[PDB]
Scaffold this active site. Sequence first.
Site, PDB file in Angstrom:
ATOM      1  N   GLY I  67      32.135  35.590  -5.287  1.00  0.00           N
ATOM      2  CA  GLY I  67      33.293  35.283  -6.261  1.00  0.00           C
ATOM      3  C   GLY I  67      32.624  35.942  -7.445  1.00  0.00           C
ATOM      4  O   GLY I  67      32.108  37.049  -7.329  1.00  0.00           O
ATOM      5  N   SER I  96      28.063  37.285  -0.229  1.00  0.00           N
ATOM      6  CA  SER I  96      28.108  38.150  -1.427  1.00  0.00           C
ATOM      7  C   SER I  96      27.311  37.325  -2.524  1.00  0.00           C
ATOM      8  O   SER I  96      26.064  37.084  -2.189  1.00  0.00           O
ATOM      9  CB  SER I  96      29.523  38.604  -2.079  1.00  0.00           C
ATOM     10  N   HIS I 121      26.506  42.663  -0.039  1.00  0.00           N
ATOM     11  CA  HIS I 121      27.305  43.824  -0.122  1.00  0.00           C
ATOM     12  C   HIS I 121      27.087  44.218  -1.912  1.00  0.00           C
ATOM     13  O   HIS I 121      27.114  43.369  -2.619  1.00  0.00           O
ATOM     14  CB  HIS I 121      28.481  44.046   0.513  1.00  0.00           C
ATOM     15  N   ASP I 171      29.219  46.098   3.688  1.00  0.00           N
ATOM     16  CA  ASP I 171      29.290  44.757   4.347  1.00  0.00           C
ATOM     17  C   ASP I 171      28.038  44.530   5.036  1.00  0.00           C
ATOM     18  O   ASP I 171      28.127  45.479   6.234  1.00  0.00           O
ATOM     19  CB  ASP I 171      30.627  44.295   4.616  1.00  0.00           C
TER      20      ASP I 171
END
Lengths: 191, 193, 181, 194, 193, 190, 190, 193, 194
Positions: I67, I96, I121, I171
């Site tokens: 987020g 993330s 990533h 990713d």
Amino acid sequence: LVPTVIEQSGRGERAFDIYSRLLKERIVFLVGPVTDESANLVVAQLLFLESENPDKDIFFYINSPGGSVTAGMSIYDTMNFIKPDVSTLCLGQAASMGAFLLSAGEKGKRFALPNSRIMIHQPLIGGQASDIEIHARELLKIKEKLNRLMAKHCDRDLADLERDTDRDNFMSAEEAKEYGLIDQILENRAS
Amino acid sequence: LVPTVIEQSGRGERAFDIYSRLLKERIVFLVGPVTDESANLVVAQLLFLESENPDKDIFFYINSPGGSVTAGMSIYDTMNFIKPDVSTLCLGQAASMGAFLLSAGEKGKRFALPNSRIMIHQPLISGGQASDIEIHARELLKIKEKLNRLMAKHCDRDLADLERDTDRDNFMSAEEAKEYGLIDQILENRASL
Amino acid sequence: RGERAFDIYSRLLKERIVFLVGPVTDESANLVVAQLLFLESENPDKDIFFYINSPGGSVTAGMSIYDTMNFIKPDVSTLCLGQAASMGAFLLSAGEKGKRFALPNSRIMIHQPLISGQASDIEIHARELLKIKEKLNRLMAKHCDRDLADLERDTDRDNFMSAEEAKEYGLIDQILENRAS
Amino acid sequence: LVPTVIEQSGRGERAFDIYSRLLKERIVFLVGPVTDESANLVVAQLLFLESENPDKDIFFYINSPGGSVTAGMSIYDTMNFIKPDVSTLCLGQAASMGAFLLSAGEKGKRFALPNSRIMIHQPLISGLGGQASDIEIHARELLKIKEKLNRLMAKHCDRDLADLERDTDRDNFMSAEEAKEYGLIDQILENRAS
Amino acid sequence: LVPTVIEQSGRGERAFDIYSRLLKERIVFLVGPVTDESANLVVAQLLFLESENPDKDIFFYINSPGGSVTAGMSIYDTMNFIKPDVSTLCLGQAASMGAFLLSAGEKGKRFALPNSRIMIHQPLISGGQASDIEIHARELLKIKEKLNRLMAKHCDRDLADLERDTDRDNFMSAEEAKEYGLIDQILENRASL
Amino acid sequence: TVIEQSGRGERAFDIYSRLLKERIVFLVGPVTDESANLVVAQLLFLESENPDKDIFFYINSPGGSVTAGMSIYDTMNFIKPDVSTLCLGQAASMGAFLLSAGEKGKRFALPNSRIMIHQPLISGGGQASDIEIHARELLKIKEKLNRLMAKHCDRDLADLERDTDRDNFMSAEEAKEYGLIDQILENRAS
Amino acid sequence: TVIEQSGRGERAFDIYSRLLKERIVFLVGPVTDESANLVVAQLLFLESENPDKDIFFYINSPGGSVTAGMSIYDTMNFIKPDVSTLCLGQAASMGAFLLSAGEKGKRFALPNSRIMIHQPLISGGGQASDIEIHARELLKIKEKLNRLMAKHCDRDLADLERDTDRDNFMSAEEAKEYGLIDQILENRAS
Amino acid sequence: LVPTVIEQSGRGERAFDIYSRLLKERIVFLVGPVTDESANLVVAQLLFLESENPDKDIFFYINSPGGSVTAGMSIYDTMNFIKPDVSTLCLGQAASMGAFLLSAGEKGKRFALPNSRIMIHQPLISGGQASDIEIHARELLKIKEKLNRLMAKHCDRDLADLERDTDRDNFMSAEEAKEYGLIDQILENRASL
Amino acid sequence: LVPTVIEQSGRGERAFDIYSRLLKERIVFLVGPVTDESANLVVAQLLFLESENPDKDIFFYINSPGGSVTAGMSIYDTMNFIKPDVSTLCLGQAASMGAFLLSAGEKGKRFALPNSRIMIHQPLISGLGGQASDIEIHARELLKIKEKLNRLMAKHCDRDLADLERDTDRDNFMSAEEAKEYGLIDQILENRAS
Ligand SMILES: CC(C)(C(=O)NCCSc1ccccc1C(F)(F)F)P(=O)(c1ccc(C(F)(F)F)cn1)c1ccc(C(F)(F)F)cn1
Ligand SMILES: CC(C)(C(=O)NCCSc1ccccc1C(F)(F)F)P(=O)(c1ccc(C(F)(F)F)cn1)c1ccc(C(F)(F)F)cn1
Ligand SMILES: CC(C)(C(=O)NCCSc1ccccc1C(F)(F)F)P(=O)(c1ccc(C(F)(F)F)cn1)c1ccc(C(F)(F)F)cn1
Ligand SMILES: CC(C)(C(=O)NCCSc1ccccc1C(F)(F)F)P(=O)(c1ccc(C(F)(F)F)cn1)c1ccc(C(F)(F)F)cn1
Ligand SMILES: CC(C)(C(=O)NCCSc1ccccc1C(F)(F)F)P(=O)(c1ccc(C(F)(F)F)cn1)c1ccc(C(F)(F)F)cn1
Ligand SMILES: CC(C)(C(=O)NCCSc1ccccc1C(F)(F)F)P(=O)(c1ccc(C(F)(F)F)cn1)c1ccc(C(F)(F)F)cn1
Ligand SMILES: CC(C)(C(=O)NCCSc1ccccc1C(F)(F)F)P(=O)(c1ccc(C(F)(F)F)cn1)c1ccc(C(F)(F)F)cn1
Ligand SMILES: CC(C)(C(=O)NCCSc1ccccc1C(F)(F)F)P(=O)(c1ccc(C(F)(F)F)cn1)c1ccc(C(F)(F)F)cn1
């Protein structure tokens, strides 16, 4: 909707929302369209009032345009089933299933306030033609039952109700009393 | 809407929201459009304060543009039925059914604040078969007349007057409403009255 | 020509055929009127063949076609294919008596006017609606050689008629099958 | 949809949109849903070809899933009213009203292609509305329509009204063979050598 | 929805919402469409009542037009598992999965009010590769058979009766439902009840 | 299909009508009732002008309606003229079916054409009875398609059933080896 | 989950908190991060009150998020208490995975429960490099799921790979025979 | 879009829209995104020009940001099939499938205007079961390799150069595109041209 | 989402929502997307537990796909600022920014469950807008953010800045083992017996 909170007493001053307070005096409200949830809420309170006191009258305030017939019937059958006299009171308006419930209160105890609007009429509303037929026949049965039951509530002949419900029929409180749909018009603390 | 919470005393000491506390002093509000829910909640409050003391005045504050005639009538009949005097106070405005209920308070106890706004007018709507259009047209006529006569009663005027003065929106100041017979007094401040 | 229809529809206009297909709007009704005027201009004596396949529509748009049928000199033969309902049935019944026809499986339906401010405005419009209801009943009764009372009775609610029942009612003259004059 | 344009020569070379060229050979197409508009375009083409020559066959190609009942009946009665035989030919699919029209062609001249799809079923409505008196009126009317269609279909297939009542109660898919069999079509065309 | 609040006395005065107060007396409601969460809420109420007293009957009020069949099967199996007899009562209507559950009550304790409406019918689905569709059709056939069999036993009728009579919507009065074997008795009032 | 350009011959033509004058017919984009029937009309018209001359049918399509496809297919087979089929860009699903349907020996692809075949695939009905009816019909269609493509490719039916269970992408060479097309074009050098 | 009703014990509880007081935990409807973590929290809390008493985990779920499911799964395995699993209505996809994950010998179903298993299924990404990355990851997930369910069912991995290629509906009996559950409950008579 | 209309003389005066008049002189445009129908329209124009004269060059003006690769392959194969050399001219931009086609012109007759923008990059997809996704990933890998190989030959570079340089968006000036081997010459004006 | 309620007894029995009960054991959850609101609820819980006891471990369960960057950095700095060790535990997924926070736990106390999913990533933006001067400002800023994160991640994993530059470019999915390996987490927990 913030319902106002109210204090009672009887050794220990209890607080409750104003509708629960009015439930203690045996008043139940039907306000707005008749749905499964709103009708079952009425059932729940009627059963509770019966088990609190099966001999005391229940006062059923109706301000409703009607709605689901099936949900209306569940209110209907519960009124007739329980021991208490369910006295009905029209306030604001009672139309369609609203008028049917109002007229279904114990005879002699069905009231309207002076400027109430009562209205009665016949039922109102895809697939293959077989499914259409089945549902059409079912809808004729509902109309026939609603008319018979209302002929009985109003102490009128079946033929009279078929005719007076063929299209929307508005009645003042006085015209409702005249029709047999209610008994008395309440004006103020006097009767 | 957060309603601020408030404290009360008197051998014991409890805390309600500010509207429940105001209800304890027999003050009842009608704010915004009269719907079934908002009208029935006024009714419930009127029934309650009667039960609590069927002889003490009730103070009915109105700030409303109107709404359902049927929901508003259910307030009117309750107001008239119950024993205590329903005093009315217009703050902000009283339009259509809001003005109707304002004019319905006990004669002598209908009030406005100095910059209230009152408005009255005939019914206005927003159907199908010509037969059904006709039933509902004749019914809307009956409601219009009924509302006019009830307004003439409250205002001590003729039906001809209210026919004329409601054919289109009719705005009134506080002074104009009093002269019309719609209210009785204009409360300026605490000191005087 | 062309006139937002086809060349096929232009060819058939040359054989004095005018179609009303689908709802009656101001637009589609005036195009009928325009065709009617045109054909009277091209020969004020020959019959027009007015093919109707319509559930009806706007009454005032319909009345424009009706008053034009009656005004021009040529007899306007009406012919129902598919359906003729409400304003569509009215127009069909309005053909020159003796030249109102229907195909064997046409659907015909007649009924009272169906609809879509201030109470004063509702009153005005409700009254105009009744005058409408009455005028159509009177006119339809004249079209059908029947009592005004019968039409008021038989249009309170949707009244479906087969081709045969329309003939009997007084709404058409002949059911057409193959080629039999 | 751009339709290609085409030359017909000899004693004067003319140009047509292809579908106009095919109309000149008395070929008419019903493609896609049957609406008042597309049906009346069929009716209009049936009227024109009878006008041009009331004795030659007309060939009605049908690739349609069905559609409006009244719109389809307007094609049906126009087929029977006009003098020419209207031969019908299913390509792709003849469904519901499309199969009603396929089976309505002149007996002997109702054809399908080997991989055509035919399907018949009772009427279906989208949806209902008014008072119970009206819903009774429309239901009584819809039941009349359902019998009218079964009775007409039975004639076309040389069957009992009961047969078509039963076999339309739910969607009923037929191969071309099964449809010849059922009496819906006469011959299954495979190629031009036949 | 404002559920009203209610007080009960007995070694201590407590407050319940009305539906919790009715739960206290072995009454459970299935109102409206049967979903996973409304179903599981019925299951939890039955688990609780069996633990409070595994030998007193449970009164299962049903006013529903149906819903998910898996969700309805969680109630069904919970009703058959728990020791207490689950009495079923139809008020308003019991249709599809609601009819099923109504009929699934303990034989002898399935009732309807006089104007209840019962309806039964075959499954009915709302909304990939032919392989996938093949698998799901096969599964749906198996579900339709199983529901017919279970209901045939509930009704003490042959399987082929239920298959015949559920091909299309089959509406029944309370009395017609009593004849079919779907309920046992019609309740009129505190007659003998 | 912005403006379709015009060329001259001795009359004026839009370019697609011009190509039609030389027995070239296009199937481009998805197969709808209306695009398929436009192909049917061209094929019928071409036969009548010359029942013996080949017709050349270009296919750049991801496929589409089965019934629409079938109507092109039965027309191809019905008419006297050989319908050559020529895949450029892609022929997938019913597109690949029609490509394979060309007169055997006259089915071509360009070197970077992409071909793809699979079983019938449906978006998303009512009562279970209706579901079973439509499910049985969908399977009849699957089996019918496998058998005709088996016949188009001169292969076992079980071969085509195994090879269209899931999406099966084929290069031009692969489609040739499979029996789906005959030659792969490049250059006029042919 | 309208109003959740209250019952008494000596305090007042909402009925689900009451059932939790008896080591009953529900998984109902789809598996989301928030519904799965609520199950994680209950399991953690139950262990701490009694690390040795069984936990009873009711499953009525069509499945949902794989990562969300995994978090219930690793928690079940981690904690001391045996997590019994009990399927009512349905356990499909990740629902069936968790049902099978119950302490072996303590996996139950009700007689009309419906069980369903299959391979991972995705709605509908960017550059081809990203596509290949996510495609490889989806296959790792498929293989991982087959191997754990093979282990849950005491079956060959190739068995589970063959049997989840397409949606596979199982009755309660069938799931028992398969190794997915242990017993089928009905009555207290047990 | 109103295409302007134009008249030409020669044994007869005729009228063309401007793009048809430009077609008359062996000029074809690919403007905007490459779709099935805009691609097939280019194909039809090339078929027509080869038939009008299989030995005169065809001038293929390209101003496009790319589009469907299958649609772009129909042009590509049609360009390689037809006898006439297809000269490519980039005006505005030639990106993705537009860059591909630009580079696919006959070696020696691929040009750009001075301020043209070229860009090249790996495929890029917009928007079932893992088996299905596996199959499509495998296919996409094969497409990405094939496009790289074809373009490597167009550019007379190794495959591994094109794979490296198309990993992300690779923008080039006309001059950078001439160096890379994607065009042959930059056109400035009627210099010697 | 009704959260269940729970009794803690002994010298007084109290009731908590379950998550409040778990906070009392110094358990904090980051679940779902990292927004300003849910991150600040984490920060607030980190502040409270330090307040209650600045020396006991805090256990930070993370099930999150990532987020907001600034929102996540607010958790990050709060983790490092407060005295208690914040042990981190992946369940489900740490993606993330969620994996940034997992790797930011106190070295030695970063854990994952056997079937956890971790993925890292580079930053991704939704989208752009204004003048080229602004787009240059935001691009220069985003490149600073990308280096800040790689450099911090490298510290957490004991790696070269170049290593994390390369392995976040696209990713990058890791099993729990692969993440221990990579230096993202310390131990993989299997059960309580360990
Ligand atoms: C269900 C039944 C137990 C029931 O509702 N009791 C009332 C429960 S409230 C209550 C009661 C006591 C103390 C406190 C409370 C309260 F309120 F504080 F919690 P029941 O009495 C019944 C059925 C139907 C209806 C109506 F009106 F909806 F139709 C109404 N009541 C009943 C009795 C016998 C049978 C038999 F034997 F025929 F099967 C069937 N049903
Ligand atoms: C229904 C009736 C009991 C009623 O509303 N009580 C509400 C008072 S609540 C109450 C009471 C005592 C203690 C505490 C409370 C409270 F507030 F805390 F709960 P009632 O007095 C009546 C009718 C109409 C209206 C109005 F104004 F809306 F129209 C108003 N009141 C009444 C009495 C007799 C009859 C008869 F004779 F016809 F049977 C009918 N109705
Ligand atoms: C209605 C009136 C009782 C009223 O609203 N009291 C509200 C105060 S509640 C209260 C009181 C004491 C202790 C605790 C509480 C509480 F809140 F904690 F529970 P009133 O005092 C009034 C009118 C207008 C306005 C204003 F400012 F809005 F305009 C303000 N107040 C009033 C009305 C009419 C007359 C007349 F006309 F007869 F002279 C005289 N006075
Ligand atoms: C307007 C009016 C001239 C009219 O329609 N002319 C059309 C003549 S076409 C014609 C003629 C020659 C050659 C070619 C053509 C054509 F057509 F091929 F180009 P008119 O006859 C009329 C009015 C209303 C209606 C209807 F049907 F709507 F009811 C119908 N017709 C008319 C005449 C006189 C007056 C007066 F007296 F009031 F001044 C008013 N109106
Ligand atoms: C899971 C099982 C513990 C269970 O649900 N208890 C819930 C009862 S709540 C309770 C109880 C006591 C005191 C207070 C409470 C309350 F209410 F306050 F919390 P169980 O009894 C069971 C399974 C299935 C079903 C049904 F109806 F869904 F089918 C029903 N009950 C059970 C028994 C035996 C086995 C065996 F034999 F397989 F090991 C497994 N499970
Ligand atoms: C209907 C039939 C005349 C027909 O459609 N011709 C279409 C060609 S139009 C044409 C013709 C000549 C000159 C110019 C044109 C054009 F194009 F410029 F307008 P037909 O040849 C037929 C049937 C099926 C199919 C196919 F391919 F779609 F399946 C195709 N053609 C045919 C012949 C015999 C019979 C019999 F004897 F069995 F009744 C029935 N049908
Ligand atoms: C963090 C750890 C304290 C923890 O979460 N307890 C949660 C139980 S709350 C609690 C506790 C006591 C009393 C009341 C309560 C309650 F509930 F009322 F609040 P832990 O036991 C752990 C890790 C993983 C998982 C699982 F299942 F999610 F995977 C589960 N538990 C633990 C122990 C040792 C280590 C070491 F030594 F390796 F660092 C690390 N972690
Ligand atoms: C189909 C084939 C007839 C064809 O497209 N003609 C179109 C040329 S329009 C034309 C021509 C002359 C006069 C007027 C016109 C015009 F413009 F006015 F209409 P063909 O030449 C072909 C195939 C593929 C492609 C390409 F570019 F897409 F790859 C290109 N051309 C061909 C040749 C040989 C074979 C063999 F050997 F396999 F049999 C098959 N096909």
